[PDB]
Every structure is written in C-alpha cells, then in structure tokens.
C-alpha cells in the first residue's frame with residue numbers, strides 16, 4: 001500500500017530562542033526523510049512551532065510585546081535556525097495559521113459528535129511550562145524563582161500550580177482497552193522498546209478523563225475558541241497535536257508557503273504519520289492522548305513514534321544562565337555542518353542522554369571522518385594510486401577480495417533495517433564497520449606499491465575500494481548531505497546513480513567512468529588540532 005512517507009518533528013513552543021534540543025529533533029526528522037528520498041520514495045517532512053497557550057502568552061508578557069508580535073519574531077528565529085542548519089524539511093507549520101485553526105475545530109466537533117466530550121471539572125496540579133496535567137504522585141517540593149517553598153514537577157522540575165476549573169473533558173478512560181490492543185497488535189509502534197513498555201505500564205494502571213478546554217481568562221485569550229462555547233479555549237495540546245493532521249492536508253507551493261487546505265486527508269496521501277520523531281518529555285501526549293483522539297474521530301493511527309533523550313555539554317546541563325552554552329551554528333562553523341550532524345547522530349542513540357565535548361567532537365572528526373572516510377576517499381582518487389583517474393576494470397577476485405565485496409553487498413539491507421526502526425546510530429555504525437574493513441583491505445594490498453609491481457592486481461583492488469566508498473557514501477548521504485556530494489563528484493558518479501534502490505547494488509557505476517577533477521591541495525575533512 002503506497003503513500004507519501006510522512007515524517008514529523010514536534011512543533012516547538014516559541015517561549016524562547018531555539019537551541020540544541022529543537023535542532024536535534026528536527027535533524028532526526030530530516031535524516032529519516034532524507035533516507036526515504038534516497039530510496040526514491042515520495043516524502044513529506046514536517047516541522048514547526050506551537051504558538052498558543054499560557055506559557056507562550058506569558059513569555060510574551062515578560063518581554064512586554066503582543067503575542068502576535070512575539071510569536072512571529074521567535075518563529076522567524078526558528079525558521080532562520082533551520083535554514084542555517086541546512087535541513088530539507090518540506091513545510092514549516094505554525095499553530096497560528098488560519099487553516100490549522102479550521103482543522104482543530106473540525107476535529108473537536110468530531111470528538112463531540114462522537115459523544116466523547118462532556119462538561120466537567122479538573123481539580124488538580126498543572127505545569128504551565130509543560131502545559132501538562134499532573135497527579136499528586138508526580139509532584140514534589142521545590143523552590144520558585146524567588147527562593148520560596150513551592151511545588152514542582154517530578155518530570156521536569158518546573159513550578160506546578162493548582163487548577164480548579166469547569167472544563168470540557170475528553171473520555172480518555174474509555175480508550176484504555178483499545179490503546180492496549182493497539183500497543184500489543186503493533187509491538188514496534190513505539191521506539192525504543194523500553195519506552196514502549198513505559199507507555200503500556202501507564203495505560204495498564206488506568207486512565208482519567210482529560211481536560212481539553214480551559215477558562216479563557218486563564219489563557220490570556222491566546223488560544224483557539226471551543227466551537228459553540230466562546231468562554232472556553234481548546235487545550236494547547238489538542239491544538240498542537242492537530243498540527244500533524246493539518247500538515248497532512250496542506251498543499252504547499254515551490255516557495256514553501258501553504259496555499260490550500262483539502263477536505264479529506266486521503267487527497268494528499270500523507271496521513272497518518274509513518275514516524276513521529278519526539279523527545280522523551282512529550283511521550284504521553286503522542287503515545288496515549290493522540291491515539292485516543294484519533295480512535296474517537298475514526299482517523300487512522302500513526303505507524304511509529306520514536307522518542308529520544310536530552311543533551312548535555314561537558315557532563316553538565318545546557319543553559320546560558322548557568323554558564324554552559326551549546327550553540328549548534330557556532331560549533332558547525334568551527335568544525336563543519338555535516339561533521340556536527342554526524343557527531344550528534346553517532347555519539348548517542350535514542351535510548352541515551354548524549355554528551356557533547358570539544359574533545360570528543362575532535363576525536364570523531366579526526367578519527368572517523370578524516371582517518372576512516374576522508375583518507376580513504378583521497379587514496380582511491382589519488383593521482384599516485386589511480387594513475388588514469390578513472391574506475392578501472394576489475395580482474396579476477398581473490399577470496400579476500402570477495403570477503404570485502406560481501407560486506408559491501410550486505411550493507412544496504414542492514415542499514416535499511418536500521419533506518420526503518422528507526423535507529424540511526426546503528427545505521428551509521430553499520431556503514432563505518434564497512435569503511436574500516438575497506439581501509440584494512442587497502443593497507444593489506446598496499447596499492448601504492450602495486451602501481452609499479454602488479455598493475456592488473458591494482459585494477460581489482462582499486463575497483464573494490466571505489467565501489468566500497470561509493471556504496472557507503474550513498475548510505476551515509478542522509479547523514480552527510482553536502483559532503484556526500486563532494487565525494488560523489490570526486491568519484492565522478494553520475495547524478496542518476498546517486499539515489500534509487502537500484503544503486504544500492506554492487507557494480508552500479510561502470511568501469512571506465514572518469515573521476516572528477518582534482519582541486520589544488522583540497523581536503524575532504526581537515527584534521528583539527530588536539531584541544
């Protein structure tokens with residue numbers, strides 16, 4: 001059943017400037033999208049900003065500007081950040097968009113027509129900073145900005161307050177048994193596994209009904225009115241989660257601006273999302289609430305949710321206020337955009353809370369990118385080794401030759417599964433295992449010596465090296481988008497052979513293909529001094 005592969009990032013609160021967390025989540029989304037495009041699949045990758053609610057409204061009050069002016073400004077900082085990061089996201093959604101608003105009301109009415117929204121009360125704790133309803137078991141003692149005793153979230157450490165409001169309630173309690181059926185019937189639908197187990201454990205215990213509206217004064221009237229009740233606004237989260245549905249229904253022009261909202265999702269063949277990339281902090285919203293609303297509406301459920309961890313720099317939390325910053329653009333200007341991406345995608349898996357340091361960033365840049373991949377690309381394109389500047393015709397293969405070829409033949413299927421879990425770290429590791437293999441082969445065969453000694457043997461060793469580098473580079477292309485293009489140019493791989501499942505096969509580029517021209521003293525990844 002073929003559709004548009006639909007991958008999303010979270011839409012981010014616009015309370016503050018964009019930082020590593022957001023960049024990371026969108027990078028993960030971008031990579032997944034990029035890979036499926038490399039397979040030759042239709043892709044639609046979505047990211048954006050969550051612009052309503054109390055949090056944002058009150059962040060705009062601190063900075064003493066209107067919410068419309070505040071939100072638009074910070075939204076532009078996000079857009080700029082993502083443009084500077086050189087992503088390939090298809091559309092940037094904002095929850096202030098008028099067409100999104102329409103979809104939110106449409107879904108609301110569905111939930112209501114279905115009998116799953118009633119007038120009740122919520123009386124309990126709330127984290128404004130997480131826009132999250134909490135039970136007493138999930139709060140604890142803490143201190144506020146003033147140094148006074150207050151309550152805080154066990155989840156996030158932010159201040160919680162007690163809310164007692166007549167609210168429209170969604171019947172989440174009625175969806176326990178169907179959510180359980182769902183998790184069980186689709187045991188890869190939440191990644192990694194231990195987070196899937198977390199979600200089941202939680203739903204097993206039982207579900208309370210969820211408040212899906214608030215009194216309008218409380219939100220400083222910065223929200224979407226509940227249909228047929230102007231005294232209420234729609235919960236920022238029901239609003240925010242609906243971005244995914246909205247995005248699936250927006251026809252987008254070449255410039256990347258929304259031009260049309262279709263009545264039915266089947267029209268654009270995107271919904272439901274094949275992968276929702278999220279951080280662990282927002283798992284309940286995506287794994288419990290979201291499916292429940294979809295089941296109520298009679299919409300289809302997403303195929304996979306992947307939830308990753310939080311970053312630290314130098315084993316300490318990132319914060320400008322604490323005296324430890326991590327500026328992606330800054331570190332990307334210092335070491336290179338692809339390199340930085342590689343590091344963030346390699347240093348940590350989705351199970352882990354990764355850690356950045358200049359030390360380890362250099363270790364990987366020098367070690368993996370320069371010595372393993374860079375050195376290899378330069379060797380097989382060297383005028384010293386590749387005397388004719390072309391892909392030679394291989395002679396007969398030795399068993400050692402074939403051992404390496406097998407590794408290259410098998411790499412795509414292995415990488416493919418990893419990109420599909422998704423588990424990008426393990427995909428990258430897969431590829432680099434093969435690059436290390438090729439280097440060992442090259443060191444063994446000493447092709448520099450073969451140029452004088454055995455030219456026929458050189459043709460074979462050199463051909464395998466080039467094809468090894470080609471395949472690995474193709475599979476790395478979603479990770480190193482700019483650098484893969486430089487690599488392919490050096491190898492002289494024709495454009496047509498740079499994507500398509502076809503070109504995962506060993507031997508796609510024919511012998512007699514000419515290398516691209518050599519630039520005066522160029523280097524693919526320059527080694528950086530050890531500090």
Ligand code: MET
Pocket residue numbers: 010011012013050240241242243282
């Ligand atoms: C529908 S995803 C919403 C995520 C939320 N805006 C956040 O930053 O955590």
